[PDB]
Amino acid sequence: MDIDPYKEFGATVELLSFLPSDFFPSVRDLLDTAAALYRDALESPEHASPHHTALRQAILAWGDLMTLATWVGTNLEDPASRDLVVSYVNTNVGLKFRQLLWFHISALTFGRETVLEYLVSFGVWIRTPPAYRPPNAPILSTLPETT
Amino acid sequence: MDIDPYKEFGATVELLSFLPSDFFPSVRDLLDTAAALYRDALESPEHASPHHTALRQAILAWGDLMTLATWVGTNLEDPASRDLVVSYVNTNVGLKFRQLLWFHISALTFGRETVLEYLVSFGVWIRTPPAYRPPNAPILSTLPETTV
Amino acid sequence: MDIDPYKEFGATVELLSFLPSDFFPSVRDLLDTAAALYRDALESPEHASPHHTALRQAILAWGDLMTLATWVGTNLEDPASRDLVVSYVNTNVGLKFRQLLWFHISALTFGRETVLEYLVSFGVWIRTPPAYRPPNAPILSTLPETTV
Amino acid sequence: MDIDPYKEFGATVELLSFLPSDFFPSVRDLLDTAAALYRDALESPEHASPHHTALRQAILAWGDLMTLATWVGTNLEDPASRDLVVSYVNTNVGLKFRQLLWFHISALTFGRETVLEYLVSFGVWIRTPPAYRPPNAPILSTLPETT
Amino acid sequence: MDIDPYKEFGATVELLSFLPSDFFPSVRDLLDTAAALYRDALESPEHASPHHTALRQAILAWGDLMTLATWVGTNLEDPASRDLVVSYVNTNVGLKFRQLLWFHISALTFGRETVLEYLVSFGVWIRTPPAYRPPNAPILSTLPETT
Amino acid sequence: MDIDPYKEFGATVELLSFLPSDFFPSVRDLLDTAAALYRDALESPEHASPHHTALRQAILAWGDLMTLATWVGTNLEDPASRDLVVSYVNTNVGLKFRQLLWFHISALTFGRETVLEYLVSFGVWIRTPPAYRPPNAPILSTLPET
């Protein structure tokens, strides 16, 4: 039903429609990335931030898909369509999931504020006719060291 | 990697295994319920608690699944295996999901501690010779508890 | 020599005799449980209580038995008596062990005093004409007890 | 499962692998010994020390075996293997049990500290090529009487 | 038994797996770089810091391997494997070593902290898409850094 | 390059040619020893001291060997020597790894200083001719006596 998984973070999806599919890091990369940067902090009993919390679901709910897709190729007698699903997933979904992921992840490094204040600007970048924006998009930078 | 979705709320799957994988109510029952009791409280910018947050995904991931399920039927000219998959879902994932899902909700009514304090007990009830399991299983009434 | 394993926790075997030697849950049930609830708390240098300690042996002595049981099959070319022995174990020692074992665990959830305060009662329930034993035996729910 | 029955006493089994089978007192002797030194204190309702407690299990769990072995020789029609089990026990187990026992027992006489500080040193003794250690091993001595 | 060489210097193995095997310098380079800069410091009696202390081991345990692979041609002119043994090494373990190896050396010039933050903020450079990441990958300069 | 793993502890290798190669207990005994006394003390985040730090590096480079040694028998069955690797190992190196290995542990329970003063004593108990050598040898005293 009508419920945004971001409203909770003073944010929205209606907001990330803008992200180019060509933007995100291979899922695999994101997973690796993440858990290699926080693991101890996750296999942890402290729901430190709601981001921490939230995240994890995403991961498992997904780990249920890569722990699914390997039940599909295993238990299926149709070589033509068994390969067609994986496409939907690793493509039409890797997005719905990378989209999400990266968000939290990177964000759990630059606060929220430091982030949203990113999207904001970027929103416009892409939103602007190829012939008008600089080949150099705006990037994630830990704000400067003068507070 | 080893990462339990419960450790956070002082709990484990290693636990739940107790419960008959056939105990938790059909999802239709859970959603029809929950959301018709917390909705306005969820289509909300405040995350009053982690439990709240926890759901959201669940629901969306699943409503990403049923958003999937109905698609599969549209884009798959093989009625043989096509109708199969959902057997691993409205049944093999129903578990993995009804399981969790339920859980949460409850606390959001009785209490994390009040819940953990549930399982346990029930755990006994089940693994207790048939001859001695009081036909009256254990449940979750809100405090029929006194005023005084 | 006369030495009860319970005197220590204000209790006696002379007691337990109450309980149907067939009440206590199959061990597989107990271990699968317990250890999946206290493990990290036991593979621990602190002995938070005697009850804790008490277990350890039990488990090890038994896991010294099942460590035995599976050996007997390897080193005994007499399928007749070989398969017999385990009849005196998964059955005649299951009692002596499931019996005790269970016990402990419980307290580590409700309370020594809260437990002794169990038996008793139940003791009545059983030795009470069939016509008057309320089909609902007595059990161990954690405090459904009020807040107020 | 992976759980040491000694971790509880700042000790370990991985630690007693070193004890020579030829070290311990006949089980029978240990039993006799023990209960003849503490009996009253055991048929007692006071779990004074966790050692007391612990111990007792060991004893009974064992008293269940000598109250077993005498159900084996009684209820068995195979004179060839009925004698082969007792060997495993009174040998491959009398160890697992004497090993243990002696520990507590003797220890419940020289504190723990006074004990562990024993094993420690001894560890090395045996650990040392026959041609190098003194025929005179290190023994259990109530520490001297100047505190 | 499982234990990590990093839990010590606030770090993890799984972490370095964060970096492409093709990244780290070939041993040859490193050794030269190293001892041609610290020699004095090392052939010294001062355990100036754990980094030193530790590391040193590494070398010798390894020197025993380049003092091993040579003895695999003195008494082993056998099949095709006098070749595909050194591979596995230089492909599987040489990495496990040049991995860690590098690591230390660095800190001994940049500072534990200065380092960790490297990997972190860097491993993501590459892990992050083309036109969406800075021109170059951020790297080492002494003076400015720690949180 | 020529460098010692001991100059760091006021001690040297050349200082152990002292001790008969046939002295240091089979690794198995040693390995077991350690972890049965520092299992938690090492899977630990505190580099409690240099000593600790040391070990770890040793075991792992060695754990890569006993994780190796059992791959020299899997993907190799040539002459009667996929077994001879271990007749140089447990003879010429398992020795220096038995050496070092021990070293530490000891001073980790007996004070490095209190230790050297061991070798010292020993590097004579041995260099001392047979008939004139004593019955018993010197060992690790956390203060007992006769």
Curated annotation (Swiss-Prot), chain F:
One function term, GO molecular function aspect: structural molecule activity
Post-translational modification: Phosphorylated by host SRPK1, SRPK2, and maybe protein kinase C or GAPDH. Phosphorylation is critical for pregenomic RNA packaging. Protein kinase C phosphorylation is stimulated by HBx protein and may play a role in transport of the viral genome to the nucleus at the late step during the viral replication cycle.
One example of a Gene Ontology biological process annotation: symbiont entry into host cell
Signal peptide span: none
UniProt key word Repeat: yes
Gene Ontology cellular component terms for the protein in this record: host cell; host cell cytoplasm; T=4 icosahedral viral capsid
Location in or out of the cell: Virion; Host cytoplasm
Impact after mutating residue 97 to L: Enhances capsid assembly
Summary of subunit composition and partner proteins: Homodimerizes, then multimerizes. Interacts with cytosol exposed regions of viral L glycoprotein present in the reticulum-to-Golgi compartment. Interacts with human FLNB. Phosphorylated form interacts with host importin alpha; this interaction depends on the exposure of the NLS, which itself depends upon genome maturation and/or phosphorylation of the capsid protein. Interacts with host NUP153.
Protein family according to the UniProt entry: Belongs to the orthohepadnavirus core antigen family.
Protein name from the UniProt record: Capsid protein
Annotated source species: Hepatitis B virus genotype D subtype adw (isolate United Kingdom/adyw/1979)
